[PDB]
Amino acid sequence: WTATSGSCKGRCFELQEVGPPDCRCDNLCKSYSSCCHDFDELCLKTARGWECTKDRCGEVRNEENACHCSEDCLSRGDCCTNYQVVCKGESHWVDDDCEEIKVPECPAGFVRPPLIIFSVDGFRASYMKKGSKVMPNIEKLRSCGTHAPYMRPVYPTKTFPNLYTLATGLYPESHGIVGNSMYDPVFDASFHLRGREKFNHRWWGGQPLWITATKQGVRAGTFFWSVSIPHERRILTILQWLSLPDNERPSVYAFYSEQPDFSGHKYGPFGPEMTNPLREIDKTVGQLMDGLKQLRLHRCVNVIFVGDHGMEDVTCDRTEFLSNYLTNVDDITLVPGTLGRIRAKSINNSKYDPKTIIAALTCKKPDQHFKPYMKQHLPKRLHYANNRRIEDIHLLVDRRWHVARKPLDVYKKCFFQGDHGFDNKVNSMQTVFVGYGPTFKYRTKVPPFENIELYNVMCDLLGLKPAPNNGTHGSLNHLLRTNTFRPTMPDEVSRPNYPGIMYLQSEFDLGCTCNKLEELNKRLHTKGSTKERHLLYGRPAVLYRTSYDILYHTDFESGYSEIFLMPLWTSYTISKQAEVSSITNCVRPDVRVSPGFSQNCLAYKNDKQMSYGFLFPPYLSSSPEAKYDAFLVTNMVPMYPAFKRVWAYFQRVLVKKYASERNGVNVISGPIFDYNYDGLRDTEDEIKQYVEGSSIPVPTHYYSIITSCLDFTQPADKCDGPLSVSSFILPHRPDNDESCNSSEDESKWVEELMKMHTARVRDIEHLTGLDFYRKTSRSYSEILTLKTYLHTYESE
Ligand SMILES: *[C@@H]1O[C@H](CO)[C@@H](O[C@@H]2O[C@H](CO)[C@@H](O[C@@H]3O[C@H](CO[C@H]4O[C@H](CO)[C@@H](O)[C@H](O[C@H]5O[C@H](CO)[C@@H](O)[C@H](O)[C@@H]5O[C@H]5O[C@H](CO)[C@@H](O)[C@H](O)[C@@H]5O)[C@@H]4O)[C@@H](O)[C@H](O[C@H]4O[C@H](CO)[C@@H](O)[C@H](O)[C@@H]4O[C@H]4O[C@H](CO)[C@@H](O)[C@H](O)[C@@H]4O)[C@@H]3O)[C@H](O)[C@H]2NC(C)=O)[C@H](O)[C@H]1NC(C)=O
Ligand SMILES: Cc1cc(COc2n[nH]c3c2CCN(C(=O)c2ccc4[nH]nnc4c2)CC3)c(C(C)(C)C)cc1Cl
Numbered sequence: 001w002t003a004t005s006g007s008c009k010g011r012c013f014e015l016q017e018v019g020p021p022d023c024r025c026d027n028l029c030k031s032y033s034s035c036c037h038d039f040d041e042l043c044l045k046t047a048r049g050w051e052c053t054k055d056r057c058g059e060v061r062n063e064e065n066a067c068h069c070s071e072d073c074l075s076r077g078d079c080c081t082n083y084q085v086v087c088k089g090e091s092h093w094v095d096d097d098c099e100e101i102k103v104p105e106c107p108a109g110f111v112r113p114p115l116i117i118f119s120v121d122g123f124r125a126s127y128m129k130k131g132s133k134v135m136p137n138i139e140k141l142r143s144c145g146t147h148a149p150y151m152r153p154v155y156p157t158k159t160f161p162n163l164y165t166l167a168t169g170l171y172p173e174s175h176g177i178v179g180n181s182m183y184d185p186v187f188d189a190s191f192h193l194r195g196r197e198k199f200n201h202r203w204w205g206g207q208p209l210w211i212t213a214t215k216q217g218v219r220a221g222t223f224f225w226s227v228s229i230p231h232e233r234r235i236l237t238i239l240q241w242l243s244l245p246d247n248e249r250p251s252v253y254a255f256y257s258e259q260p261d262f263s264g265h266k267y268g269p270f271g272p273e274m275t276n277p278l279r280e281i282d283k284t285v286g287q288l289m290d291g292l293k294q295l296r297l298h299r300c301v302n303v304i305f306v307g308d309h310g311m312e313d314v315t316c317d318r319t320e321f322l323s324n325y326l327t328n329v330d331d332i333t334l335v336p337g338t339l340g341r342i343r344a345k346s347i348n349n350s351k352y353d354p355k356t357i358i359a360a361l362t363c364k365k366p367d368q369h370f371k372p373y374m375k376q377h378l379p380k381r382l383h384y385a386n387n388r389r390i391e392d393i394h395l396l397v398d399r400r401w402h403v404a405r406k407p408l409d410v411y412k413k414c415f416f417q418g419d420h421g422f423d424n425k426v427n428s429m430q431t432v433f434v435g436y437g438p439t440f441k442y443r444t445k446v447p448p449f450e451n452i453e454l455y456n457v458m459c460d461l462l463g464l465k466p467a468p469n470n471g472t473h474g475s476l477n478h479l480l481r482t483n484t485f486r487p488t489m490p491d492e493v494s495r496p497n498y499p500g501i502m503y504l505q506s507e508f509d510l511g512c513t514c515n516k517l518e519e520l521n522k523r524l525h526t527k528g529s530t531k532e533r534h535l536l537y538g539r540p541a542v543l544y545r546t547s548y549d550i551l552y553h554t555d556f557e558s559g560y561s562e563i564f565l566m567p568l569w570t571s572y573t574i575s576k577q578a579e580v581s582s583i584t585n586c587v588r589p590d591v592r593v594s595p596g597f598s599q600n601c602l603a604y605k606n607d608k609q610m611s612y613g614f615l616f617p618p619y620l621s622s623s624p625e626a627k628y629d630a631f632l633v634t635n636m637v638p639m640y641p642a643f644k645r646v647w648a649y650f651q652r653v654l655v656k657k658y659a660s661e662r663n664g665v666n667v668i669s670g671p672i673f674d675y676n677y678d679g680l681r682d683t684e685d686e687i688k689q690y691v692e693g694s695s696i697p698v699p700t701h702y703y704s705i706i707t708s709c710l711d712f713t714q715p716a717d718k719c720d721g722p723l724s725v726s727s728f729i730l731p732h733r734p735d736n737d738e739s740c741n742s743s744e745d746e747s748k749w750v751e752e753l754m755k756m757h758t759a760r761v762r763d764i765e766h767l768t769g770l771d772f773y774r775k776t777s778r779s780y781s782e783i784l785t786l787k788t789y790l791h792t793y794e795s796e
């Protein structure tokens with residue numbers, strides 16, 4: 001119910017919401033239909049527009065005007081933003097030279113630099129260049145402040161998931177806004193762009209920035225802006241709030257523009273109609289900067305210019321229809337568009353079978369423009385599985401396309417020429433970041449980074465302790481002049497054992513069908529003499545309680561888990577000059593590790609589905625003496641034959657190719673167990689599948705971290721400076737149904753699979769409980785940046 005009898009006189013855009021009886025005058029009142037009857041008249045004034053003119057300079061204040069050009073307007077904080085330019089001969093901010101902001105230059109009473117988050121919907125990364133001639137204000141922010149060439153959104157690359165990720169530092173699976181449309185089966189409730197259900201606070205998880213702020217005594221302005229409040233009024237409202245007294249004035253503000261996204265949907269990302277929305281947003285930026293300059297805050301405030309996602313060319317004709325694949329199409333519910341989510345139309349349908357749906361959608365047409373996945377099989381970098389709001393069956397849609405259930409959906413609903421939502425590594429989905437202000441660096445370019453990292457930085461900018469989140473706090477220290485966050489490396493929880501030779505060969509029953517110059521040399525390789533070569537960045541630290549052994553070898557070093565019966569990690573360096581050799585069913589006991597903590601070949605013989613591979617690649621053995629170490633039982637891991645095709649091509653072909661290209665590489669490989677798809681290391685008791693008749697757990701994924709010298713004129717093993725990394729988390733699957741070309745030679749499809757399953761080191765850390773890069777010559781923040789890097793394989 002609504003009770004509207006009171007007045008907004010002197011209360012327009014008041015910050016503290018009032019409850020009934022009082023009617024409302026805050027920015028959300030319109031959305032809750034609770035505004036005082038005189039809200040429009042008093043709070044949404046438009047008379048005489050938004051600009052002072054010479055003829056208004058010095059006017060008698062008329063309270064009906066949208067903004068003021070009277071002598072008192074500065075002290076009231078309600079001048080039109082161009083007042084000082086038109087009436088006091090000042091220059092527009094954009095026409096002033098950039099001058100370094102070394103320290104905050106704030107009015108008396110300011111306890112910290114305010115932060116203004118200027119968010120632009122659908123602002124594609126390449127607009128910064130392509131639109132440069134029509135966006136002088138934005139171009140000034142970008143060139144004078146700190147900017148990235150692009151910022152990576154989260155998947156799906158939709159608005160509410162991205163904006164809420166910016167606010168929380170969380171992946172969508174964790175904050176709960178997993179799409180623009182959702183069904184929660186626990187609550188039996190549907191979230192839609194249109195309607196009331198989205199206002200229910202149960203949808204919105206984590207702790208968004210305005211709550212983190214409030215809880216720590218830092219006041220916040222609105223983040224949500226009602227669509228009908230024109231941009232000019234939003235800006236003036238922010239500027240009025242910044243004129244408030246010390247104990248009422250917010251320290252954090254947000255502005256949101258629905259452009260260029262609104263036009264981008266109609267016209268496509270580079271339609272000729274797009275130039276005017278870009279000019280208009282730039283003008284709004286210049287209003288804000290001029291307004292701040294009037295208030296003497298343009299060298300006080302930190303401004304973040306940020307987008308939620310990009311925009312791709314998508315038309316009605318490029319729609320895939322499930323009715324062309326499914327005979328049972330009326331038995332499913334599809335969440336459609338630039339991603340697909342399928343569930344049963346009725347939970348009382350006992351014929352509904354996901355496996356049959358997935359099979360009917362798999363590689364059925366040669367140019368098929370989507371791929372079906374069970375959500376646990378999506379690339380782990382998407383972090384898109386661990387929420388009951390995410391349907392088990394997912395369709396990853398190719399850029400430029402849509403999926404829909406039936407054609408009648410796409411003509412009873414061409415209109416649009418642009419859309420977004422695709423895989424967050426797609427170039428068209430990239431968006432923008434610029435930071436301008438005293439706390440940001442001056443004329444500095446930083447590498448691309450992920451939007452999950454910004455919450456921590458905004459907390460650093462405001463002196464807040466961030467809520468637990470998915471950023472890696474310190475990885476964006478390089479954006480900041482001051483207020484850097486300086487963490488310590490996590491403490492190692494489990495110390496390694498260093499077993500020597502403790503077992504005789506006859507103590508083992510594996511079922512595997514099998515000179516003092518080179519005797520002290522093999523002893524010393526088992527005691528760790530080449531370890532400097534193969535373990536370039538220190539041993540990984542184990543951040544959980546467990547029992548493991550460090551095993552040294554001529555060609556590789558491993559941390560062998562006595563609990564999972566295989567390595568957690570295997571580390572080796574392949575020089576540019578290394579040779580690849582030919583290679584059978586010999587697996588040898590490791591006399592350092594007990595039979596009881598080893599695998600055996602019999603289990604593999606009995607398990608007709610499961611085979612085995614090796615973590616250190618026998619192909620890359622340095623000498624035929626070293627080659628025996630590659631066939632130790634402690635280097636064996638369980639592998640489906642289907643996956644062995646992938647792994648062998650990586651090991652036999654790709655590692656050497658990378659060493660050639662990168663001037664040596666250091667590789668760390670290992671298993672991952674994530675049966676509950678939460679992106680976190682499984683405990684022993686979460687493992688769902690073992691090699692038949694054994695306690696050998698089956699990994700869900702295999703990782704590798706491939707490190708070399710950023711200056712590739714230096715070899716990986718003698719690198720003086722910054723490092724370069726690429727990594728992957730490959731799904732350990734019993735088929736290659738993912739790869740529609742897999743009947744062909746591995747050179748036509750394996751590398752494509754690996755690229756899709758590219759990963760950050762930090763993803764692997766979450767999944768393994770390991771901490772890498774413990775002993776480098778690099779600063780710890782530089783290393784945290786390195787650990788967040790993702791090799792995306794998209795051109796510039
Ligand atoms: C990205 O960053 C985030 C943030 O750090 C990481 O997520 C954290 O991960 C932790 C592990 O998965 C998790 O810790 C659990 O918290 C439980 C209490 O959680 C509630 O309270 C917090 C605190 O304010 C709140 O934030 C939570 O919010 C979640 O749930 C609500 C609604 O249900 C959502 O609105 C909200 O979006 C959020 O949902 C997300 O997380 C939940 C899981 O909490 C998922 O289900 C959702 O899909 C979504 O992803 C909650 O309101 C606590 O109960 C857990 O403890 C169990 O396990 C331990 C073992 O250590 C045991 O000791 C406990 O007793 C307990 O076990 C008992 O319960 C079991 C399950 O019912 C039962 O089987 C057992 O037998 C036992 O009885 C645990 O401490 C933390 O909640 C989330 N936080 C958030 C915000 O997501 C995330 O991991 C990072 N991602 C990566 C990849 O690094
Ligand atoms: C800086 C910041 C601001 C905001 C405020 O965002 C909004 N204020 N006003 C609107 C929004 C979102 C878009 N919106 C849509 O319905 C919409 C728009 C474009 C679309 N394109 N495709 N689908 C679309 C759906 C409604 C208008 C938030 C929160 C979390 C409060 C939303 C967090 C942060 Cl960090």
Ligand SMILES: [Ca+2]
Nearest residue numbers: 121122159308
């Ligand atoms: Ca958007």
Ligand SMILES: [Ca+2]
Nearest residue numbers: 674680681682
């Ligand atoms: Ca897990």
Ligand SMILES: [Cl-]
Nearest residue numbers: 179180181335
């Ligand atoms: Cl969606």
Ligand SMILES: [K+]
Nearest residue numbers: 604607608610
């Ligand atoms: K087998």
Ligand code: NA
Nearest residue numbers: 736737739742
């Ligand atoms: Na296949």
Ligand SMILES: [Zn+2]
Nearest residue numbers: 122261265420
């Ligand atoms: Zn959009």
